[PDB]
Structure 1
């Protein structure tokens, strides 16, 4: 690799980071949008105030403003559902470690309630909240309301650092390695500039995902993150070994690889900054399918990339990985649904199943009420789109289990529901090839009516090759496609994936059978469960 390849391609100009003139040739259309107007100005210079006043029909009449609502607003966590819910915006938060409060939950519920049939909310595969139904004129007030309850939506989509994932049992599990909350909190504060915006990390070549591991279970899925912090002692000191480059895409899925780097615990933010600066400064900005950080690592080689991280560390020091980490390979992933004792004597947490992560305003208020009456006003989200309510005095559990809402959001649903994960799909997402959430519930219910089983089989449904619901991690994965019935009629279908493993012995699943009509999936899945997962016909 030539020395010229290592010239930083972006520069700071008036508080923002822009592509240098000499590197602007051959860039993709999204890069052109960022050059034409800095997206962060919508927040940091309050550009949103005037934009929100313009009728959407008028906005659509000029490239600049249409790009504002369709592209730049994703820097403020706002996603125009142009195709499937025109004029409405999904809104996505920062929620490090999946931690929310009852007050925040009630606020979000009050927003979606206003929108009636156009509103609802979802737990995401990054243990995050999304709300739906937002209209542009309401955005300035919603931004204010979020701030008032201690939430930000900054930098949650597009070419930004995505939600920092941690251990859903952080601080409460007798078996945790290290509480991940301080680290994911620090990362979120760094990324968002303490909720003011951080332009230094908002002009990346592409999205970038971090997680901090604190569980032997590896609930955080470090193998599929762009940066994963693996807890490790080195020379008598606590810190993290670093894995880099994990990602999924339509074109390519790759597991994270060792950077061959260890940092002391206090260097979590400095090394996040160094890695992001290297990616920002040096990443390819052509074909969008070749812009994720792993592509830079392949171009430079991992050692070449490591040197770029090292030069961006304070005092330019980056230690080599510790030979061993603290994650025990002898481990069985633990079910977190149901009632479990905390490490604080006399307290329990309860894991509640949220069917395909979907909630309405009334449901959110109920969950917030439970967290206040039984817990400490805290609700935790999980990457399987479920919830945990921690800090419940164990003597209250008997009463809690009789709460009517637990018949819908159950601490002990059937085993296949426990592991079911589904993306948004075509109800709202314009990329979706099929409907996911309703279909996956229907099929799973029918399958479980036919077979019983004891193995915790994890089924993931995703609506298109973007694989937001991570079909490559599933025991059985379903990727949306269009296919044909026996008469040659167009029908919704799924490509069925097998072979995904999580935890320390992780593995990426691959397509097993293409183009199965959705109406034909039940018998296929029933047979797979009996033949490969020990299920027994009822």
Structure 2
């Protein structure tokens, strides 16, 4: 690689970071959008206040404003549902480590409640909240209300650092390696500039996923993150080995690889900044399918990329990885659903199944009430789109198990439901080829009616090749497609994936059978479970 390739391609101008004029040739249309107007100005210069006053019909009449609502607003966590819910916006938070409070939960419920049939909420595969139904004129007031309850929505979509994922059992697990909350909190604060906005990291060539590992279970899926912090001692000090470049896309899926770098715990933020600066400065900004960080790592090689991170460190040093990390390879991933003792004697947590991650305002209020009455007002989200309520005195569990809402959000659903993960799908998402959430529940119910099993089989349903519900990690994965019935009629279908493994012995699954009509999946899945996962016909 020529030394010229290493010239930073962006420059700080008037508080924002912009592509230098010599590096603007051949860019994709998303880069053109960012050049035409800095997305962070919608928040940091209160551009949203004026935008929110313009009728959508008018907004749509010029490129600048249309790009504001369709692209730039994703820097404020607002996602126009142009195709499937025109003029309404999904809103996505920063929720490091999946931790929420009852007050935050009631606040979000109050927002969606206003929108009636256009409103609901969802837990995401990055243990995050999304709310739905938002109209533009309400945005200024929602931004205020979020701030008031201690939340931010900043930089949660498009070319930004996505939700910092941690251990759902952080601080409460007798077997934890290190509490991930301080680190995921610190990263989120760094990314969002303490909720004011951080333009130093908001003009990336592409999205970028971080996680901090604290569990032997690897609940955090470090193998599929752009940056994963693996806890490891080095020379008697606590810190993290660094894995880089994990990603999924329609074109390519790749597991994270070692940077061959270790940092002390206190250097979590400095090294996040260094990697992000390297990516921002040097990343390719052409074909959007070749813009994720791994593509830069392949072009420079890992050592060339590592050198780029090193020079952006303070003291310009980056220690080599420690030979062993703290994660035990001998580990059976633990079920967190149900009632489990905390490390704090006299206390339990409860994992509740949230069917396909979907909740209404009334459900949110009920979960908030349980957290206040039984817990400490805390609710934790998981990447399987479930919840954990921690800090329940164990003597209250008997009363808790009789709560009527636990029949809907169960601490002990059937085993196939425990592992079921499903993306938004075509109810709201404009990229979706099929309906996912309702369909996956129905198929799973019908499959479980036919077979009993003891293995915790994990089934993931995703509505298009963007694979937001990560079908490549599943025991059985279903990727939406259109296909044909026996009469050649168009029907919704799934490509069926097998071979995904999670935890330390991770592996990416691959298509096993293409184009299965969704109405034919039950018998296929019944047979797969009997033949490959030890299921027994009822």
Separation in 2, partners of 1:309, 1:102: 40
SS of residue in 1 equivalent to 2:216: coil
Q: What does residue 98 of structure 1 align with?
A: 98
Displacement after TM superposition at 1:120 (Å) = 0.0
Q: What does residue 249 of structure 1 align with?
A: 249
Runs (4+) off by over 4 Å: none
Q: Deviations over 1:153-197 (max 9, x none)?
A: 000000000000000000000000000000000000000000000
Separation in 2, partners of 1:488, 1:398: 55
Separation in 1, partners of 2:410, 2:275: 41
Match status 1:467 vs 2:506:
no
Displacement after TM superposition at 1:418 (Å) = 0.1
| TM-score w.r.t. length of structure 2 | 1.00
Separation in 1, partners of 2:389, 2:515: 40
SS of residue in 1 equivalent to 2:247: coil
Q: What does residue 307 of structure 1 align with?
A: 307
Q: What does residue 289 of structure 2 align with?
A: 289
Displacement after TM superposition at 1:354 (Å) = 0.1
Displacement after TM superposition at 1:419 (Å) = 0.1
Separation in 2, partners of 1:346, 1:225: 36
Q: Deviations over 1:467-502 (max 9, x none)?
A: 000000000000000000000000000000000000
SS of residue in 2 equivalent to 1:492: strand
Q: What does residue 140 of structure 1 align with?
A: 140
SS of residue in 2 equivalent to 1:516: strand
SS of residue in 2 equivalent to 1:356: helix
Q: What does residue 41 of structure 1 align with?
A: 41
Displacement after TM superposition at 1:29 (Å) = 0.1
Q: Deviations over 1:33-60 (max 9, x none)?
A: 0000000000000000000000000000
Separation in 1, partners of 2:24, 2:239: 39
Separation in 1, partners of 2:48, 2:354: 34
Separation in 2, partners of 1:523, 1:193: 51
SS of residue in 1 equivalent to 2:477: strand
Separation in 1, partners of 2:180, 2:139: 32
CA RMSD, aligned part only? 0.1
Q: Deviations over 1:422-441 (max 9, x none)?
A: 00000000000000000000
Separation in 1, partners of 2:323, 2:83: 50
Displacement after TM superposition at 1:351 (Å) = 0.1
Separation in 2, partners of 1:99, 1:84: 30
Q: Deviations over 1:370-391 (max 9, x none)?
A: 0000000000000000000000
SS of residue in 1 equivalent to 2:251: coil
Structure 1 portions without partners, runs of 5+: none
Displacement after TM superposition at 1:503 (Å) = 0.1
Displacement after TM superposition at 1:91 (Å) = 0.1
Displacement after TM superposition at 1:339 (Å) = 0.2
Structure 2 portions without partners, runs of 5+: none
Q: Deviations over 1:420-468 (max 9, x none)?
A: 0000000000000000000000000000000000000000000000000
Displacement after TM superposition at 1:396 (Å) = 0.1
**Superposition map of 1:281-360 within 5 A:** 281-360=281-360
Separation in 2, partners of 1:478, 1:106: 34
Displacement after TM superposition at 1:260 (Å) = 0.1
Q: Deviations over 1:323-362 (max 9, x none)?
A: 0000000000000000000000000000000000000000
Separation in 2, partners of 1:388, 1:228: 23
Separation in 1, partners of 2:433, 2:245: 27
Displacement after TM superposition at 1:132 (Å) = 0.1
Q: Deviations over 1:1-30 (max 9, x none)?
A: 000000000000010000000000000000
Displacement after TM superposition at 1:77 (Å) = 0.1
Separation in 2, partners of 1:370, 1:407: 14
SS of residue in 2 equivalent to 1:301: helix
Q: Deviations over 1:213-257 (max 9, x none)?
A: 000000000000000000000000000000000000000000000
Q: Deviations over 1:312-333 (max 9, x none)?
A: 0000000000000000000000
Displacement after TM superposition at 1:78 (Å) = 0.1
Q: What does residue 10 of structure 2 align with?
A: 10
Separation in 1, partners of 2:39, 2:331: 45
Q: Deviations over 1:60-88 (max 9, x none)?
A: 00000000000000000000000000000
Q: What does residue 162 of structure 1 align with?
A: 162
Separation in 1, partners of 2:324, 2:216: 14
Separation in 2, partners of 1:320, 1:181: 25
SS of residue in 2 equivalent to 1:106: helix
Displacement after TM superposition at 1:408 (Å) = 0.1
Figure out how many residues of one structure are paired with residues of the other and give that number.
538
Displacement after TM superposition at 1:298 (Å) = 0.1
Q: Deviations over 1:116-172 (max 9, x none)?
A: 000000000000000000000000000000000000000000000000000000000
Separation in 1, partners of 2:145, 2:235: 47
| TM-score w.r.t. length of structure 1 | 1.00
Separation in 1, partners of 2:126, 2:105: 17
Separation in 2, partners of 1:151, 1:339: 28
Separation in 2, partners of 1:56, 1:3: 48
SS of residue in 1 equivalent to 2:253: coil
Displacement after TM superposition at 1:272 (Å) = 0.1
